[PDB]
């Protein structure tokens, strides 16, 4: 038996992103090639398929900690903003990106809206993530 | 004076790489760049190609330092 917490999280995220891309049923916004992921970024993501990686990361976060909304996701993906000759400060991520990722995951039926607000994993999503974790553990061993 | 490194191998530099480099005790992108007058990106790509072909051996990989050695 293998669960997510048993494996390396970076390898798990890569494997889950590959799985989502291979399934190919995840809805991708038309503007993924134009936007940057936050106002504190300077450039758009280097990886062309950054949307699948972000979706996998969001699903893993929902597995670890359910009930997170778009605000929580933007807090999760926030980072340091450099302000030129002024000091740096914390800045949040793109609400549209977080919302589209959550809606796409809901479209895949791996994510459902929680009763108390926010999103959570469906049993199907939990099963998919545990299977991916088992594959990662098998690959490592 | 400013050092003008090569972004892509010429025939002589590529031959010198494939001949001498797999014989060094310490193989790093920085030392290869210094010896062959190539850029760090070209050195990293060349060392990855040599590792794929099996001419050299990987000692350690890290985001800031990658260390290879001869077989």
């Amino acid at each position: 038996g293998v669960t997510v917490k048993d494996v390396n999280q970076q390898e798990f995220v890569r494997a889950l992103a590959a799985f989502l891309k291979k399934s190919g049923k995840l809805k991708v916004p038309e503007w993924v090639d134009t936007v940057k992921l936050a106002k504190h970024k300077e450039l758009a993501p280097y990886d062309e398929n950054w949307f699948y990686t972000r979706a996998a990361s969001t699903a893993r976060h929902l597995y670890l900690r359910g009930g997170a909304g778009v605000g929580s996701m933007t807090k999760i993906y926030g980072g340091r903003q450099r302000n030129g000759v002024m000091p740096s400060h914390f800045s949040r991520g793109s609400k549209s990106v977080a919302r589209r990722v959550l809606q796409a995951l809901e479209g895949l039926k791996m994510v459902e809206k929680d009763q108390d607000g926010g999103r959570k994993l469906t049993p199907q999503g939990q099963r998919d993530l545990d299977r991916i974790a088992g594959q990662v553990a098998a690959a490592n061993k | 004076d400013k050092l003008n490194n090569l972004v892509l191998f010429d025939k002589a530099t590529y031959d010198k790489l494939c001949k001498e480099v797999p014989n060094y005790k310490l193989i790093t992108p920085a030392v290869v760049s210094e010896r062959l007058k190539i850029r760090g990106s070209l050195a990293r790509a060349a060392l990855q190609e040599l590792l794929s072909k099996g001419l050299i051996k990987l000692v350690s990989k890290h985001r800031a330092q990658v260390i290879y050695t001869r077989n």
């Binding site: 917490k5 048993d6 494996v7 390396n8 | -």
Partner: protein, 140 residues
């Protein structure tokens, strides 16, 4: 039902290890001990097991819950809590001789494995950026 709950501290980081009769499991926040980040300091976590041997831990399951502080402080809190939990379990459900010998090994290697470091941040004082440094003084 044999179990102990023992804490370890480092700055504001606190880790509580629940050590009960078991088969040799060690978890931190539900994750394997080898998966805790940063892995630059993985040997700091592995030190109790490396020093005492896996045979001592083979009879217990230890689950560690850690919170507060930073990454390094949490690492040190986890290792201290694991060591103190094993010592407490031995002194409670085994003889005193085994507890004494494992405690001697741990103390000889590193006292902070069993005794907490009492250092804490010093308060800032007005007239300077921190506890001791003062703002630059000009004359003319």
């Amino acid at each position: 039902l044999q179990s102990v709950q023992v804490f370890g501290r480092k700055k504001t980081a606190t880790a509580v290890a629940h050590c009960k009769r078991g088969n040799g499991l060690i978890k931190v926040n539900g994750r394997p001990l080898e998966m805790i980040e940063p892995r630059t300091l993985q040997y700091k976590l592995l030190e109790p097991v490396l020093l005492l041997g896996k045979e001592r831990f083979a009879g217990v399951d230890i689950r560690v819950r850690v919170k507060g502080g930073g990454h390094v402080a949490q690492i040190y809190a986890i290792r201290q809590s694991i060591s103190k939990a094993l010592v407490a379990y031995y002194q409670k459900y085994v003889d005193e001789a085994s507890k004494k010998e494992i405690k001697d090994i741990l103390i000889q290697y590193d006292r902070t494995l069993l005794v907490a470091d009492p250092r804490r941040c010093e308060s800032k004082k007005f007239g300077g950026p921190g506890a001791r440094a003062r703002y630059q003084k000009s004359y003319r």
